[PDB]
């Protein structure tokens with residue numbers, strides 16, 4: 001079973017011997033520090049509160065096991081068995097901590113307070129920063145949900161220019177990242193952060209996470225359609241690629257189907273196999289069940305353009321009201337190789353220069369969507385800003401001489417709306433002056449109980465585009 | 467509870483209707499595809515065999531739950547209920563699969579087969595590639611262990627040159643990445659892969675993973691020392707940084723202690739606080755308990771060089787047998803900000819240029835060691851290379867015209883030793899000719915059971931440097 005006594009940075013085990021004596025309160029905050037990515041989607045804290053922090057988390061056996069492990073780890077006795085036994089006997093193992101956050105789904109500019117942590121018992125001054133390590137890991141669902149939303153902005157801009165509406169926007173980016181992430185638990189959390197902005201996912205693990213910790217009115221938050229891989233094509237033999245194509249579109253003639261076509265020669269497959277030999281099985285398909293050709297190699301922009309030119313000469317093309325070319329409704333294209341936020345912008349801009357509408361194409365991303373992200377992308381940081389010693393409170397901060405970008409905020413913090421409708425974080429307890437309205441932070445956790453929750457439905461609504 | 471029926475890519479559920487009819491065998495393999503990082507460390511397979519693949523993995527309840535989820539996910543009933551009911555009734559929920567693999571810890575050049583997967587029942591031809599997604603995730607411990615070993619190579623070269631031996635090598639790179647990874651399960655896997663090469667870690671979760679799935683002779687595989695953070699220094703007050711230093715070094719006066727010193731001015735704390743105000747508490751410390759000064763901001767190379775020049779003028783410096791300068795044995799330095807494999811080489815080369823020995827310094831890394839890594843750094847890939855249909859086996863392969871590097875191998879594979887002592891992978895069953903000796907892969911999994919395993923002590927021995 002999970003042991004919260006073994007889920008911290010090793011060195012923090014010794015921090016109860018370094019704080020100033022006669023200290024009764026430690027107050028810390030989380031932010032996406034200022035330095036692209038000017039606003040962040042706050043999401044994922046609710047998952048950590050329920051799975052790791054709520055309820056009875058301390059037992060006599062868990063204290064004894066931490067004592068045994070840390071004895072050999074440090075080659076010394078340094079564990080705070082006395083402090084952890086006080087929580088067990090007085091609060092039945094419930095953590096005496098209060099956490100205030102911003103509602104999940106909110107879009108907030110860089111450099112503002114997103115949540116605060118503090119202890120509610122003077123004896124547990126050391127407990128505030130013990131749970132820093134587990135809490136800081138919220139940088140991952142924040143960054144996945146932000147980076148996915150910024151890719152939605154690019155897609156929405158070019159779809160509106162070339163078509164005149166946003167029909168089908170919310171399944172133009174499919175999640176191919178299950179096998180490209182570092183673990184099973186990461187796959188579930190990352191695919192859920194992507195479903196805040198889109199609807200298509202191949203990463204099954206994200207569905208069960210949402211229903212267990214968030215919930216939705218619909219049966220499932222994500223959907224998929226049948227598709228082929230290189231094994232189900234090459235298994236027929238090099239000389240029988242056309243046999244594998246005919247068989248697969250016939251088994252799935254009533255639903256959409258994606259077919260990877262670059263096993264040997266992608267341009268041969270589009271012009272000769274799809275566009276001639278099997279053309280009669282494509283033009284008869286329904287608008288609700290098109291064929292989706294999938295290239296998978298080469299230069300991403302050059303391959304998409306050459307593919308569209310080949311298909312345009314073999315199938316009837318129309319011109320929409322904005323002047324851009326459009327394929328017949330029974331034929332589309334999906335590009336799912338080498339796709340990140342940078343390449344996605346290069347592709348749609350190139351398609352627009354060649355007078356091709358964004359209606360024709362959708363995208364898929366694997367490692368770029370779920371794995372190629374770090375904690376310094378948005379500079380997520382956790383720092384102490386207020387302590388009480390000998391009954392008097394002081395403001396605490398850091399300010400390295402060689403880097404003013406690492407300066408931290410001072411005192412008790414609060415988040416408010418500006419008169420022009422923006423955000424501002426007030427320091428040194430100045431929010432008590434009541435000049436900026438109501439603090440937008442809400443108590444989500446106190447003394448081992450989750451005091452306020454949000455559904456996955458409200459979160460999607462909070463993260464909408466303008 | 468984990469359900470293997472929900473731990474695959476969505477599309478793989480629709481693959482049992484796409485293979486050629488009368489197919490009784492699907493045979494697939496894993497490689498680090500060829501085109502820095504010329505050889506890879508194979509580690510991580512055993513963890514996945516025990517936690518997810520062995521034993522009764524199919525029940526009547528798990529079949530019904532996967533059925534219910536897929537009807538909403540696909541808006542159809544494509545799920546293969548009949549295939550999974552046969553495995554339950556015929557094999558008591560045990561997977562009829564055989565896996566062969568190279569011994570864990572082995573160092574193998576790029577472009578060689580590392581493990582193979584095939585079905586042992588003709589009815590379960592679809593099972594081989596169903597477990598591709600879970601097995602491909604072994605890319606992460608392989609890449610962490612490889613990138614960590616390459617960093618050990620750089621440190622060994624410059625330590626031997628500036629000092630004359632390798633004393634202290636196994637803890638010159640400490641793992642700081644607990645808070646910087648994407649989940650709790652990722653932290654345990656990645657820290658365990660780092661301990662293959664080094665012995666210092668702050669990510670506690672790696673210790674329990676090793677003892678449960680690999681085992682070691684000693685009580686624990688990793689160690690740590692007491693250290694400060696920014697909250698335990700700045701909580702004393704801006705004008706009281708000296709008081710915090712004196713307290714911390716007195717509480718830990720008999721063991722090594724690391725003290726972050728860049729809260730306000732790193733260069734002032736080195737020259738005036740450590741080098742003047744508190745110098746009498748440093749020169750009295752034991753060689754087994756030095757003070758370790760830790761900078762944490764600015765340019766990594768420029769800061770380290772200036773910190774060394776300051777201390778060299780406040781403390782007695784000697785010259786070792788190779789001519790390089792050395793601090794007194796009670797004074798060391800650790801640099802744990804912005805360290806990856808690129809900057810680690812720049813720092814160590816610049817230290818040598820200024821005649822400073824590598825004995826004076828250690829390093830720590832967080833996001834660069836455990837998070838800033840993807841699946842295409844080593845080109846880890848899983849592909850089918852052999853099937854049997856109508857009783858006749860054929861060689862299958864992919865070969866895209868726009869990317870010769872994506873070409874895969876054909877037929878039954880085997881790994882052998884060359885007469886000069888190198889590795890070669892034989893294709894198309896040519897290993898049966900017995901011209902290259904015996905196959906180096908070993909059956910590690912068969913019909914639901916682990917058939918061969920390795921201890922963490924054997925893995926470390928196999929992964930040693932030349």
Ligand SMILES: Nc1ccc(/C=C/C(=O)NCc2cc3cc(-c4ccc(C(=O)N5CCC(F)(F)CC5)cc4)cc(-c4ccc(F)cc4)c3o2)cn1
Nearest residue numbers: 171174176199200202223224225227258292332333362475
């Ligand atoms: N490692 C890997 C893993 C996988 C792969 C290759 C995967 C692949 O090719 N996927 C194709 C694909 C999925 C998909 C899902 C949707 C989709 C998403 C959401 C909804 C939805 O909101 N609802 C459906 C259910 C409902 F009830 F109807 C109301 C709500 C519907 C469909 C749409 C298209 C599509 C793409 C391009 C097109 F042109 C057309 C469709 C889709 O295309 C490669 N490597």
Ligand SMILES: Nc1ccc(/C=C/C(=O)NCc2cc3cc(-c4ccc(C(=O)N5CCC(F)(F)CC5)cc4)cc(-c4ccc(F)cc4)c3o2)cn1
Nearest residue numbers: 009637642665666668689690691693724758798799800828
């Ligand atoms: N998010 C985070 C997390 C942490 C931080 C800052 C952390 C910090 O400052 N850590 C200091 C530190 C630990 C440490 C461990 C060892 C160590 C590791 C392994 C062994 C070992 O091999 N064994 C244990 C004992 C044994 F019994 F022999 C068997 C084997 C011994 C020591 C050595 C030094 C050191 C650093 C610099 C020096 F100059 C010298 C030492 C060490 O220094 C920042 N952000």
